[PDB]
Amino acid sequence: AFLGDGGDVSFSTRGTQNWTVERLLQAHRQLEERGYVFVGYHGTFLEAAQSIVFGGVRARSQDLDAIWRGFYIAGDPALAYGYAQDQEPDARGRIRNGALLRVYVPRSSLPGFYRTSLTLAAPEAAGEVERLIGHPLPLRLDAITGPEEEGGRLETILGWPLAERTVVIPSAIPTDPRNVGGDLDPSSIPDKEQAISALPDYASQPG
Amino acid sequence: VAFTVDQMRSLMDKVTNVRNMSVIAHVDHGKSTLTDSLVQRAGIISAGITIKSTAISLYSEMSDEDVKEIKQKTDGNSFLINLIDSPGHVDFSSEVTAALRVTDGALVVVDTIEGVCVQTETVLRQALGERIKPVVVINKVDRALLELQVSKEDLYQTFARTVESVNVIVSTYADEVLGDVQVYPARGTVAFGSGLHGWAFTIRQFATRYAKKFGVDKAKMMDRLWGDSFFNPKTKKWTNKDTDAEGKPLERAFNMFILDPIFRLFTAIMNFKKDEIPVLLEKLEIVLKGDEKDLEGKALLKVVMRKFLPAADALLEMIVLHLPSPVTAQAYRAEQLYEGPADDANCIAIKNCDPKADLMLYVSKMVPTSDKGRFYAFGRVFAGTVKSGQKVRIQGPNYVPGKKDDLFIKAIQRVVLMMGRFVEPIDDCPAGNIIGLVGIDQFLLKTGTLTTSETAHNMKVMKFSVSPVVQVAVEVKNANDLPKLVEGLKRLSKSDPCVLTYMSESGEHIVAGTGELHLEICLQDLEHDHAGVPLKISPPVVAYRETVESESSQTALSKSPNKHNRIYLKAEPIDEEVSLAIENGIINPRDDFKARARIMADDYGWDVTDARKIWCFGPDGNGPNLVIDQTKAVQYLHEIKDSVVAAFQWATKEGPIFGEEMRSVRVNILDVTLHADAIHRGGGQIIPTMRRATYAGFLLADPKIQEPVFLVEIQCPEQAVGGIYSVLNKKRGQVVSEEQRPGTPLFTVKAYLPVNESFGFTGELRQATGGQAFPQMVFDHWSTLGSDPLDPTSKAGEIVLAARKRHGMKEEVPGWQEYYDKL
């Protein structure tokens, strides 16, 4: 268990249950102590978070070119915040808020983390990425970080093999049920969480 | 007795022998106890679809000589008695009037010791205002003998004072158009007995028995059996002075021939005098059977008194012989029950109880049934005959012969007898009888008037409203009982048309009522019946509305998460007239868009252009809120309509101020930019966009909140009227009018009372008027607070902040910037 001590953690529209800031600091500490490192956030809907936190990140089909398949996370929680919501309304047409998740990997996987200035998910970057990771896409036991779009914010792609080795825990950053679609207000980010949200230094050159 | 549908019909066409009456009694007076004695005696049973008991049918048979005493037209020796159920407390005033309005007679139950209580007294003057003839029964006589052990003269004087206080109320409030309606024991309009032990008698009952032993017509015999009449035992002479020649006291007739025999049995049995009881029982001819010959104490006394003077027979006697039939009563209650001309073709048909004229059926309430979630209309035919399949004009509250508002020309699926808990279909039903109807619950909320005449006005309407102005949050104490509560709420909302159970966005289970008390009883039934599970109920909360005061300071802009879609809009207030029109069905969502626009344009000054660009109403797709399409040449605009509408439904259900429904809010979509590929204009993208833009526009249109306001009608004696104003002047109440009843000293004060000031109102009004006040409030209008909801200190802001915290929201109300596009 990597969720720390407390009640049963569940995901709701009212917010994550039994997940204070203090419990996060504990779980984060216990994670570092076991050789794990924080690499970013992952915004998604309630049922998904549940599956990830309690079942683990597992590979699945996704709408994109096969060479870019993998788990998608972002260093800046504001970016991942935009995906923390239902992507499709229910029968009546409700679109409820989601949850922000924190992704941790074994430090042993850090040698596989690289970065690039090029925009990802584009054929114009595939070559450079394949150069850095030292093999043809898709990503495997490695990860790539680069602008989600031209001039946009950074994103990180965890090759599924590496993504299935993550340990994900809830974030103390709450989604807003009365403002679904709104942008993350930086003042809603617990100063204590911001302190533990520093990202590792990624390689700009291949191994 | 078991009756066939043929027998009932044959019994229902003889209206002259029907007794429409209710029982006016305090619950702690054995109201249900005397009622039980009646149903176990005269209760009619039929020789699948069950309903909530609302009325009971009783059968009573009498002799040819008895029928000759009835001072009203009669036909035959059979009598149908409709015992219409009454509320369990005065507080349920609205339905207290409902029962009384469909009745003609009243059995007023009064206590022996305590006499007439404040409640029964208040209900009585209401019944008298409805022109209901009362007959009295002094219950709890058992207590006077066993506990108090009073003498025969003490008990008599006790009855004399009790009857005295009753006629004080009667002669005072009973309208002079009915003649002397006062009750006199000597005239068989007053009975005495104990509901508990199940015995009761009238002066007429003992008069009949001694009538032979004195070779005397019971007329002058029952005349003697009360008041100052004395039968000197030594001289065997009847006298009018309470002393003999030597100045010795004489026992009065009532104490001698009526009370003595009863006092004898009470003493013989309760003292276990085994040798007296047999002798005492024989001369009264009370024969015990097998098991009964061994009984002792109260066990024996109960049997002996039940066989000596059966309770139901004394009551049935007064009911049949002294209570007005539909024919006799409708003659003087018609003008009062008709909201139109007195010489109208229909009003006249009501006075004559004419079964041939246009139908005039009254619907007093809607009764829950086992046939799905449908309700069965309950009422009384005041004119014409109701038939199965017959097409009738269902005229609701707002209905007026002029307009076609609140009118539904539908057909009666089936007409049925309300046999207490069961249903019995019949072909038709002549005027004068109580009946139930099938297939009207979707046209009549609770009350209304059925008519077959295109020129007949509604009958005296009883003001009601489904508007949930108060609500609470239900929550199981044990997380495993969740399914039991979920089904409990689904059950609760079905037992009452005016109860609302829904789920807020947060997922909370909400129960909303029409008033403090109405919501109180519902939370009880839920935690004891529908669910039966320990519940955690939050304090009661008043329901508010969010609205705008002007047009948005500027255009509201908001883009989708994918940054490819944008919605430009602007909010503006909607005229109260219009919002009222929408709430009143005039401006209808399911109405043709062209026909509807003509109305809004001609009758409300709307640009017919905009009125045809209405995309939807809200919330629930019919509220007093509108989305108007004012875009120009937007490609694929229609392919997002379903989403935009959906968003508006949620945005109007819970506003940006503090989660409360919107009211009178017009949203004008000014412009839209969409991605070319429909893969990026799905619900997931548009819904939030529209939702947020609406919030931004709302917050820019000078936000305001509206509070619900009651209209309270209070009946109160002149003396205690001062206590009414005393309470209203600290509840922000505003007096509308103060009318006085012509003859009586009864006043009818009407005033507006903010719902958030009505909590415990009846309790305070009770004390201030000594219990003489008869409250009756219904939702009237919404009132916009002047104060700024965005200001935490202002009266509006105070409410807002308190609510926001209570909901766990950010204490401060969001600025339009939060929902506006983050540029």
Ligand SMILES: NC(=O)c1ccc[n+]([C@@H]2O[C@H](COP(=O)([O-])OP(=O)(O)OC[C@H]3O[C@@H](n4cnc5c(N)ncnc54)[C@H](O)[C@@H]3O)[C@@H](O)[C@H]2O)c1
């Ligand atoms: N989601 C983010 O936090 C994030 C961060 C940066 C960029 N992006 C952008 O979003 C696009 C993909 O969005 P996405 O990743 O949310 O959708 P996706 O199609 O890549 O993944 C599908 C969804 O399945 C859900 N899920 C449920 N159980 C899971 C499990 N056990 N393991 C893994 N996933 C599970 C995830 O929440 C995820 O949202 C990318 O192309 C990228 O450009 C997203």
